[PDB]
Design a protein around this ligand. Structure first.
Ligand SMILES: *[C@@H]1O[C@H](CO)[C@@H](O[C@@H]2O[C@H](CO)[C@@H](O[C@@H]3O[C@H](CO[C@H]4O[C@H](CO)[C@@H](O)[C@H](O)[C@@H]4O)[C@@H](O)[C@H](O[C@H]4O[C@H](CO)[C@@H](O)[C@H](O)[C@@H]4O)[C@@H]3O)[C@H](O)[C@H]2NC(C)=O)[C@H](O)[C@H]1NC(C)=O
Ligand SMILES: *[C@@H]1O[C@H](CO)[C@@H](O[C@@H]2O[C@H](CO)[C@@H](O)[C@H](O)[C@H]2NC(C)=O)[C@H](O)[C@H]1NC(C)=O
Ligand SMILES: *[C@@H]1O[C@H](CO)[C@@H](O[C@@H]2O[C@H](CO)[C@@H](O)[C@H](O)[C@H]2NC(C)=O)[C@H](O)[C@H]1NC(C)=O
Ligand SMILES: *[C@@H]1O[C@H](CO)[C@@H](O[C@@H]2O[C@H](CO)[C@@H](O)[C@H](O)[C@H]2NC(C)=O)[C@H](O)[C@H]1NC(C)=O
Ligand SMILES: *[C@@H]1O[C@H](CO)[C@@H](O[C@@H]2O[C@H](CO)[C@@H](O)[C@H](O)[C@H]2NC(C)=O)[C@H](O)[C@H]1NC(C)=O
Ligand SMILES: *[C@@H]1O[C@H](CO)[C@@H](O[C@@H]2O[C@H](CO)[C@@H](O)[C@H](O)[C@H]2NC(C)=O)[C@H](O)[C@H]1NC(C)=O
Ligand SMILES: *[C@@H]1O[C@H](CO)[C@@H](O[C@@H]2O[C@H](CO)[C@@H](O)[C@H](O)[C@H]2NC(C)=O)[C@H](O)[C@H]1NC(C)=O
Ligand SMILES: *[C@@H]1O[C@H](CO)[C@@H](O[C@@H]2O[C@H](CO)[C@@H](O)[C@H](O)[C@H]2NC(C)=O)[C@H](O)[C@H]1NC(C)=O
Ligand SMILES: *[C@@H]1O[C@H](CO)[C@@H](O[C@@H]2O[C@H](CO)[C@@H](O)[C@H](O)[C@H]2NC(C)=O)[C@H](O)[C@H]1NC(C)=O
Ligand code: NAG
Ligand code: NAG
Ligand code: NAG
Ligand code: NAG
Ligand code: NAG
Ligand code: NAG
Ligand code: NAG
Ligand code: NAG
Ligand code: NAG
Ligand code: NAG
Ligand code: NAG
Ligand code: NAG
Ligand code: NAG
Ligand code: NAG
Lengths: 214, 357, 411, 243, 54
């Protein structure tokens, strides 16, 4: 896609070229200001002295000097603003390296649209290009989830790790599974917390489960 | 220039247009009626005649030469004829000339002919107006002519135009102040529901005048922030007229060097496009047989345009949704996976520039 | 061409010499908008299954509710007194918008087909149109932005991604969020009515505060209006530059040709052309800077949606001042308005904490999970409790780690 | 709306009804407030902004204008067709409301007329007595003159009128053409003669002014002085004054 | 008014024609500062019990 000059590639090429074109135009704009007479007989300093005697020629030049210094002041102001804008962008580039490339982040949606696996990076004109390698689901597994377990003096059991889903399998045993990938784990007693009550959404425990559950 | 696509090429200074949207006029006008609205006041018209008598002669080589010793005559007023003033509500100024010639200096008893022949022309010198435009509806508080260069604002250059060259012989000085008392006239009619060249209460422009029913205008006329006339009131009836442009900006969709379609606010055929549909903000004319499902080539805003002129609108990306932290009942957990790679660019630094002042 | 040369056939000819200047101006604005639309389109999305139950009418019914929740007559019944002013309504003006959105848009304040009607005096928008200045819709127009926020809100109560639209009660979705803040152990004493009442009242006061034109509401109204006023002034400033003579006899092109012959009139016009092109260059530069400023703001808006609305964040203080429970969002002029629902403590419980336990060959025991506080209860037993909410849990052996030594602060 | 007339000039407030043209009376005659201020509820009928510009000025502006009333003399009645006023030795005896004892800068004549009538009302001549004593007279004619005086109509005219300054009955200067309607005449101490707010004629300072009416010519004559005020102007006509 | 017209009674009169320009300038700066103060005040806070031992 790059060689051909993919929505992400088209977006990058447009943005990268725009950064380059902007700096180019800034300097091209500045050089053409030298063609501005600024109400002088000519924009060319040597032409003024070639045609007109010093006592009058100096006056023509003073107008060109004032004009050209003004153009430089405008350039400097414009340049400093662009640097401020980049500063904010740079902080993002730094955060991306530290949280996507050098480490695993827990910030949802930060390192691409999907579940982040790893990131690589390369050089680009005036900056970096990031390659976010993410996992994309192609099919979903349905399970019947249990809010918790009511066991018996009765007590409730809830899952200690709130990121896991408790469900019952085809062999009637309890399993835990994370919600980002279906990787089922047999449930054990160290995974549960005892509480005083039971909800209406809790499943009724049987004696055959208790040895592994509590 | 001779065709709608070539008119775009001429405007852009290109012989090869790229796929995209180019700004065009919805239409072009010319050869239209003139409409004027003056302050009623009273009719009182003065005809003003300036006669220029040119004294042409000849040189050894034959280079025809006019004589600074030429005579400009203004009408008679207050006995002196060196300063004529306009003291009427309306006026018309005409310049006429007589060309006389001589072999002997200062006799002028013979008509000028051939290469000696000249006609007097009054041209702009330092005045913010041409002499010949004083017969348009120009307005003054005061206007007076003077052959004397004393306490006078600007001057006109009076020249003799020959078949060889042209040179200034005399200056005519004019005293004036801006105002609405004295109005120039050629030798209060407006044309409704037509494109017209108008001059309304001192405001000149081209547009369409329409009669409306409103009480918005407090004064003679109402203008926009840009100074353009948006409407005016008739002093006698209180009826309000609106003023609009004869044409508006339109966007021409050009694909493969041809006009495929265009968007305009006016419901009128443009650029040879006869079929159309309606969008939320504008009308769309195209080659497509309109009284769709296609892939657009060019886009802008939220609009795409297909090769055949079909107009398509862009949808918002769909998704299945997010997985929620719910552990009750039948829930879904992603199981099968593949890898996608997303690419993004972030600017890190600027290119430093060093300038030697 | 229209801005500089006002449809005058004779001015446009002079302007030929400056075609490259006009192309630079038009292309610079077009590229700015193009880049913005791409990154905005990347941010926005919808979900049909979420939209189906995102409305107030959907919430007030049982039609989409999963049968397992027979105890609940509707979706978020107890929370609806608040949600009804956040969720979009079908039975309203301007299709599908929420009560707060209507107040925010109408207290702040494009069809060009009408500018050619000619049955009245043109307003400011048409007067600008006539000068070549027009406003276009982009990708994030108000209708698309509304769908985006509605899809996010409707996702909270969507039970599955398998297909169809099976809903769960809002109260169930909220209880799930409470477990991320702290594992809830007090199951016999539900506080849902208390939380729901506080929520409904808070929204009541917010909706009222907008209608009245609450520090947070005053701040939002000031900021939203300022964004709108700034764009308005930018264009009003540009149109009045057309009244500048730029040392010409007149600012009006047709007046110059009406009064003065072509060989001199063209010179007067050349000064106006130079002046007006200069004004456009200043406009373009100013516009591009504003877009850069917004880009930074947009990244924050995107982060807020992903970390406050679509998920629970672990970043302290990011999603409002307090302990974050959930976030809802709506449309606003040029952006989004976020409603951060947070928990606010009203009373603190004092406990006597244990640094660790020294047990007996002696050894120390420390708590494996450093976010929990170990304390001894009135029955002399050990309990663990998180520091964000007082939800005490009986301690067990699987919660402790053995170490060689004991501190002086160990019990 | 019901119209009542109240008169407390003899120390007792008396209430009676009004017929004639009550609406016109409430639109032209006001009671002067202490300090010479014009009541905030006065509509300013026929009170024009005094300007030197030839153009039409509108909007909110702060200017020095003769809006302080030393004495308002309503519906004046003269012993004869002619009358004399002075900027200095003037005597205030018929002032409606408060009277302020100061020097008058401008004498403002609010003319009585009806729209679309062209009635036989106007002044034959206005005679201005300058410092030295030179008497300059203003009179307007049906056509262009090339000793008989002329006629300056009040209200709507049937046609054009050419105004001249007279001396020895011999025209001394051409001033210009009157507007379609003459609603206000205002004459300043400093030698400026205004018609409907526009400076029509200027000369040397004026000690006294007099005129001869043809055959109730005025709504009121106000003896005023200059002050700084914020005024709202619509077509050179004052709609509101904040001092 | 003071920046443009340096207390000169006669300049201030001319400046009357530009009052709307001055109001735009003064209001623009006032609004900028007002918005900043609100979001800055939101950020800042104190705690007396913490200050006591700080
Ligand atoms: C963030 O990242 C996620 C990925 O995790 C993106 O979400 C995916 O978006 C695409 C594009 O909309 C979705 O694909 C669509 O699926 C619809 C329903 O699926 C049917 O077809 C599949 C075929 O494999 C069957 O298996 C399935 O059972 C259904 O029968 C289709 O109807 C859609 O069709 C559209 O495209 C085709 C091809 O061009 C046209 O012919 C159709 O007319 C129609 O326009 C489409 O195939 C995908 O399912 C989403 N996945 C997930 C997990 O959400 C997000 O979009 C991305 N976010 C952003 C902002 O980009
Ligand atoms: C994940 O992908 C696998 C294939 O790699 C799916 O397994 C198939 O399941 C279908 C029934 O749905 C069987 O008919 C096929 O024989 C299976 N093929 C295998 C075992 O490779 C699996 O079902 C998918 N997971 C989900 C949730 O759809
Ligand atoms: C402004 O309005 C006047 C009427 O108030 C128009 O003048 C009249 O036009 C009608 C045409 O039906 C004639 O019969 C009358 O004789 C005209 N004069 C009068 C006094 O009524 C005038 O033409 C209008 N001007 C414009 C520009 O529309
Ligand atoms: C979860 O989905 C399964 C299907 O995959 C449901 O099980 C079916 O329920 C219907 C009754 O509606 C029975 O007729 C089928 O025979 C059942 N199929 C199987 C394989 O058991 C299950 O009831 C759903 N559970 C919940 C809570 O919705
Ligand atoms: C703003 O919030 C307050 C809560 O502090 C609401 O005041 C309560 O009103 C309800 C009845 O609607 C009572 O049950 C509570 O006892 C009141 N609590 C108080 C007074 O603290 C108030 O009504 C809300 N305003 C709006 C417009 O909803
Ligand atoms: C949390 O709020 C409850 C009330 O809902 C407080 O319970 C009360 O405690 C006081 C003593 O402090 C008793 O006199 C009341 O009878 C209790 N009312 C009840 C049980 O509802 C509780 O103490 C508060 N928690 C803290 C830490 O202050
Ligand atoms: C003003 O006119 C009214 C009538 O509109 C006069 O009212 C009369 O008052 C006397 C008592 O003074 C009654 O006996 C009459 O019956 C009233 N007339 C009517 C028609 O009701 C009022 O008196 C007049 N004002 C003055 C000062 O005379
Ligand atoms: C029109 O211009 C004249 C000057 O030609 C102004 O006359 C001055 O009036 C003031 C009173 O405010 C005197 O102090 C000056 O001495 C007068 N100048 C001269 C030369 O006499 C006159 O006031 C202006 N009128 C208006 C309406 O602006
Ligand atoms: C203002 O002028 C009008 C005439 O334009 C005067 O009205 C006339 O007054 C005489 C004398 O009383 C009556 O004979 C006429 O019949 C009245 N004419 C009309 C049309 O009513 C009026 O009196 C004058 N008013 C003032 C305040 O001077
Ligand atoms: C668990 O079993 C008991 C005894 O039959 C019953 O009363 C209770 O309702 C059951 N729990 C649920 C959630 O159905
Ligand atoms: C000009 O006016 C005449 C009526 O006098 C009308 O018939 C004609 O159509 C008009 N043409 C244009 C271009 O306005
Ligand atoms: C101007 O000249 C023309 C002849 O071309 C004559 O008929 C007309 O009456 C003259 N006008 C004046 C004011 O002399
Ligand atoms: C103009 O008139 C003068 C007399 O003032 C005469 O001598 C001269 O020849 C004339 N010049 C011309 C007709 O060019
Ligand atoms: C130039 O002038 C001189 C002196 O009058 C004369 O003798 C000579 O013939 C002239 N030559 C010409 C007319 O070229
Ligand atoms: C103006 O006249 C048209 C045509 O009769 C009518 O439809 C419209 O409502 C009128 N508008 C007003 C303000 O009278
Ligand atoms: C398609 O073109 C035909 C002419 O060949 C025309 O009669 C028909 O109405 C057009 N269809 C539409 C939708 O305009
Ligand atoms: C999606 O595009 C179809 C046309 O194919 C349109 O009818 C529909 O309303 C669009 N929906 C959304 C949510 O944009
Ligand atoms: C829900 O429906 C009932 C009618 O059954 C109605 O009275 C109530 O106001 C509705 N609630 C909302 C928030 O619309
Ligand atoms: C624990 O008990 C032992 C034995 O009495 C004592 O020496 C030690 O200091 C106690 N630990 C602490 C922290 O007081
Ligand atoms: C004022 O006039 C009324 C009505 O004629 C009269 O009754 C009263 O006595 C008069 N006052 C004086 C002081 O004469
Ligand atoms: C003006 O009136 C006076 C006094 O009656 C008289 O002497 C004078 O001649 C009159 N002048 C004119 C022009 O009527
Ligand atoms: C003008 O005023 C002087 C002041 O002494 C006086 O002598 C003269 O008669 C007056 N002329 C008039 C009133 O026409
Ligand atoms: C004519 O003017 C002179 C000015 O010197 C004056 O003295 C004389 O009295 C005037 N004549 C008449 C009849 O008023």
């Amino acid at each position: 896609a790059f060689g051909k000059v993919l929505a992400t590639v088209a977006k990058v090429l447009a943005k990268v070229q725009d950064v380059v074109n902007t700096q180019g135009q800034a300097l091209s704009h500045l050089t053409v200001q030298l063609q501005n007479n600024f109400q002088a007989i000519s924009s060319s300093i040597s032409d003024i002295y070639n045609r007109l005697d010093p006592p009058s020629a100096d006056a023509q030049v003073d107008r060109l000097i004032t004009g050209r210094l003004t153009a430089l002041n405008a350039f400097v102001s414009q340049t400093l603003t662009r640097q401020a804008e980049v500063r904010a962008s740079r902080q993002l580039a730094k955060d991306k390296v530290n949280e996507c490339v050098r480490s695993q982040s827990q910030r949802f949606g930060f390192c691409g649209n999907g579940t982040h696996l790893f990131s690589l990076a390369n050089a680009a004109p005036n900056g970096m290009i990031f390659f976010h390698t993410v996992l994309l689901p192609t099919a979903y597994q349905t399970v019947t989830a249990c809010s918790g377990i009511c066991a018996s003096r009765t007590f409730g059991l809830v899952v200690k790790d709130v990121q896991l889903t408790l469900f019952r399998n085809l062999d009637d045993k309890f399993y835990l599974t994370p919600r980002t990938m279906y990787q089922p784990r047999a449930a054990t007693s160290s995974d549960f917390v005892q509480i005083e009550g039971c909800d209406v959404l809790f499943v009724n425990a049987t004696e055959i489960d208790l040895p592994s559950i509590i | 220039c001779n065709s709608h696509i070539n008119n775009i090429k001429c405007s852009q200074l290109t012989a090869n247009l790229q796929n995209g949207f180019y700004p065009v006029a919805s239409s072009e006008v010319g050869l239209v009626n003139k409409s004027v609205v003056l302050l009623p006041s009273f009719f009182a018209h003065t005809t003003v005649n300036i006669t220029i008598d040119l004294g042409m002669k000849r040189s050894g080589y034959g280079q025809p030469i006019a004589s600074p010793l030429s005579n400009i005559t203004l009408p008679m007023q207050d006995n002196n004829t060196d300063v004529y003033c306009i003291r009427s509500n309306q006026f018309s100024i005409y310049v006429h000339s007589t060309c006389k010639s001589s072999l002997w200096d200062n006799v002028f008893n013979q008509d000028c002919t051939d290469v000696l022949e000249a006609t007097a022309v009054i041209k702009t010198g330092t005045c913010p107006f041409s002499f010949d435009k004083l017969n348009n509806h120009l307005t003054f508080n005061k206007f007076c002519l003077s052959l004397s260069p004393v306490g006078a604002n600007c001057k006109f250059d009076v020249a003799a135009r020959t078949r060889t060259n042209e040179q200034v012989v005399r200056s005519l000085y004019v005293i004036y102040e801006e105002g609405d008392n004295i109005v120039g006239v050629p030798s209060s009619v407006l044309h409704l529901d037509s494109c017209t060249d108008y001059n309304i209460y001192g405001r000149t422009g081209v547009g369409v005048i329409r009669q409306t029913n409103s009480t918005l205008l407090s004064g003679l006329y109402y203008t926009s922030l840009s100074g353009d006339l948006l409407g005016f009131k008739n002093v006698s009836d209180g009826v309000i007229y609106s003023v609009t442009p004869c044409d508006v900006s339109a966007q021409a969709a050009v694909i493969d060097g041809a006009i495929v379609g265009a968007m305009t606010s006016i419901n009128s055929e443009l650029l040879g496009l006869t079929h159309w549909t309606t969008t939320p903000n504008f009308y769309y004319y195209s080659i497509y047989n309109y009284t769709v499902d296609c892939e657009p080539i060019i886009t802008y805003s939220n609009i795409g345009v297909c090769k055949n002129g079909a107009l398509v609108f862009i949808n918002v990306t769909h998704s299945d949704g997010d997985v929620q932290p719910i552990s009750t009942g039948n829930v879904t957990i992603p199981t099968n996976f593949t890898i996608s790679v997303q690419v993004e660019y972030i600017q890190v630094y600027t290119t430093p520039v060093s300038i030697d002042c | 061409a229209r801005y500089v040369c006002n449809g005058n056939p004779r001015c446009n000819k002079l302007l030929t010499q400056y075609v490259s200047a006009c192309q630079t101006i038009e292309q610079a604005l077009a590229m700015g908008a193009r880049l913005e639309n791409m990154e905005v389109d990347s941010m926005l999305f919808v979900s049909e299954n979420a939209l189906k139950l995102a409305s107030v009418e959907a919430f007030n019914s049982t039609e989409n509710l999963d049968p397992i929740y027979k105890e609940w007559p509707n979706i978020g019944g107890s929370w609806l007194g608040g949600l009804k002013d956040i969720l979009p309504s079908h039975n309203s003006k301007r299709k599908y918008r929420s009560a707060i959105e209507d107040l925010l848009f109408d207290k702040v304040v494009e069809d060009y087909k009408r500018c050619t009607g000619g049955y009245d005096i043109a307003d400011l928008v048409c007067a600008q149109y006539y000068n070549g200045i027009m406003v276009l819709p982009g990708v994030a127009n108000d209708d698309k932005m509304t769908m985006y926020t509605a899809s996010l809100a409707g996702g909270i109560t969507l039970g599955a991604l398998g297909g169809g639209a099976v809903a769960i009660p809002f109260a169930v979705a909220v209880q799930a969020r409470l477990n991320y803040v702290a594992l809830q152990t007090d199951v016999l004493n539900k506080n849902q009515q208390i939380l729901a009442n506080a929520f409904n009242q808070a929204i009541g006061n917010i909706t009222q505060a907008f209608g009245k034109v609450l520090a947070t509401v005053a701040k939002v109204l000031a900021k939203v209006q300022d964004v709108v006023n700034t764009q308005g002034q930018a264009l009003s400033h540009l149109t009045v530059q057309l009244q500048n003579n730029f040392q010409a006899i007149s600012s009006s092109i047709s007046d110059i040709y009406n009064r003065l012959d072509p060989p001199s009139a063209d010179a007067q016009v050349d000064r106006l052309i130079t002046g007006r092109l200069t004004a456009l260059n200043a406009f373009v530069s100013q516009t591009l800077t504003r877009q850069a400023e917004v880009r930074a703001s947009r990244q924050l808006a995107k982060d807020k949606v992903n970390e406050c609305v679509r998920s629970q964040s672990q970043r302290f203080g990011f999603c409002g001042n307090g302990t974050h429970l959930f976030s809802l969002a709506n449309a606003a002029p040029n952006g989004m308005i976020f409603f951060h629902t947070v928990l606010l403590p009203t009373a603190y419980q004092t406990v006597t904490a244990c640094s660790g336990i020294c047990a007996s060959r002696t050894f120390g025991l420390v708590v494996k999970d450093v976010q929990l506080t170990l304390f001894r209860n009135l029955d002399d037993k050990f309990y663990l409790t998180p520091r964000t909410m007082y939800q005490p849990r009986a301690a067990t052996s699987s919660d402790f780690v053995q170490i060689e030594g004991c501190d002086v602060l160990f019990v | 709306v019901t119209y009542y007339r109240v008169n407390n000039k003899n120390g007792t407030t008396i209430v009676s009804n009004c017929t004639d043209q009550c609406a016109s009376y409430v639109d032209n005659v006001f009671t002067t407030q202490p300090g010479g201020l014009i009541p905030s509820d006065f509509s300013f009928n026929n009170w024009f902004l005094l300007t030197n510009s030839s153009t039409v000025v509108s909007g909110k502006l702060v200017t020095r204008q003769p809006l302080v009333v030393n004495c308002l003399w309503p519906v004046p009645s003269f012993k004869e067709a002619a009358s004399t006023f002075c900027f200095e030795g003037a005597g205030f005896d018929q002032c409606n409301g408060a009277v302020l004892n100061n020097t008058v800068d401008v004498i403002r004549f609010n003319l009585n007329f009806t729209a679309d009538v062209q009635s036989g009302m106007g002044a034959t001549v206005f005679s201005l007595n300058t410092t030295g004593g030179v008497i300059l007279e203003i009179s307007c004619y049906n056509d262009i003159v090339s000793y008989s005086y002329g006629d300056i109509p009040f209200g709507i005219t049937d046609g054009p009128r050419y105004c001249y300054v007279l001396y020895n009955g011999t025209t001394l200067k051409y001033l210009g053409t009157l507007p379609p309607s003459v609603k206000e005449i205002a004459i300043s101490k400093w030698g400026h003669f205004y018609i409907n707010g526009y400076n029509f004629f200027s000369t040397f300072p004026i000690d006294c002014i007099s005129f001869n009416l043809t055959t109730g010519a005025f709504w009121t004559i106000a003896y005023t002085s200059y002050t700084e005020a914020l005024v709202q102007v619509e077509n050179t006509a004052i709609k509101k004054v904040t001092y």
